[PDB]
Amino acid sequence: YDIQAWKKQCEELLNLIFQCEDSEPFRQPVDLLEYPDYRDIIDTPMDFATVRETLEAGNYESPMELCKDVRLIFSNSKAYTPSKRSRIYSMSLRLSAFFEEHISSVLSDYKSALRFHKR
Ligand SMILES: COc1cc(Br)ccc1CO
Numbered sequence: 001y002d003i004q005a006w007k008k009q010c011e012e013l014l015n016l017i018f019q020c021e022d023s024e025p026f027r028q029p030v031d032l033l034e035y036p037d038y039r040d041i042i043d044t045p046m047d048f049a050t051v052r053e054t055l056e057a058g059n060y061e062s063p064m065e066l067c068k069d070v071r072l073i074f075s076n077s078k079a080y081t082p083s084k085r086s087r088i089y090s091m092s093l094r095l096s097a098f099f100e101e102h103i104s105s106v107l108s109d110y111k112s113a114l115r116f117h118k119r
Contacts (some may be wrong), residue, residue, distance in 0.1 A: 001116040002028050002109075006063040009056065009106045014052050018101065023048060023089040030080075041080055046072040063106050070099055 017023050029047050030038050038045075051069050060066045074096045081089035 001113045003113045003117060005113070006106050009109075010055055010060075010063055010066050011052075013102050013106070014048060014055070016102070017048060017095065018052075020095065020098070022095045022098075025088045026077070026095065028058045030076075035080070038080065042076050044072060044076070046070075046076060047109075048073065062112050063103070067103055067107065070103075071096075074099075075089070079097060 018027065027048050029045050029050070030042075039061055048070075051066060051073075054060055054069065055066060055074050074092050077089050077092035083089070
């Protein structure tokens with residue numbers, strides 16, 4: 001029932017994500033010189049370095065907020081892809097499956113800890 005445990009669990013999951021080859025297109029903001037129309041489609045850019053920095057700055061109050069930003073990385077890739085068969089989008093789908101598989105217990109434990117705190 002540790003209300004704070006999610007933070008280190010998210011730091012470790014982000015470390016695993018950065019070790020994965022599939023995260024390379026998502027480690028830093030999308031390069032606007034390479035993709036000049038990016039901001040015509042994507043309203044809110046997001047990347048894993050921004051997520052990690054927000055977490056380390058103490059600017060996430062819960063793992064749900066972190067999860068919303070990571071999911072935004074994936075929805076931006078889906079929205080920007082010209083094809084569902086594109087390389088970068090395909091990498092995003094595998095990374096999303098890995099992220100969802102690992103964030104589930106982090107969210108469950110945090111929500112359970114909060115419920116115990118308010119019992
Ligand atoms: C299952 O192995 C994966 C896959 C992805 Br994508 C991201 C990280 C890991 C962990 O090394």
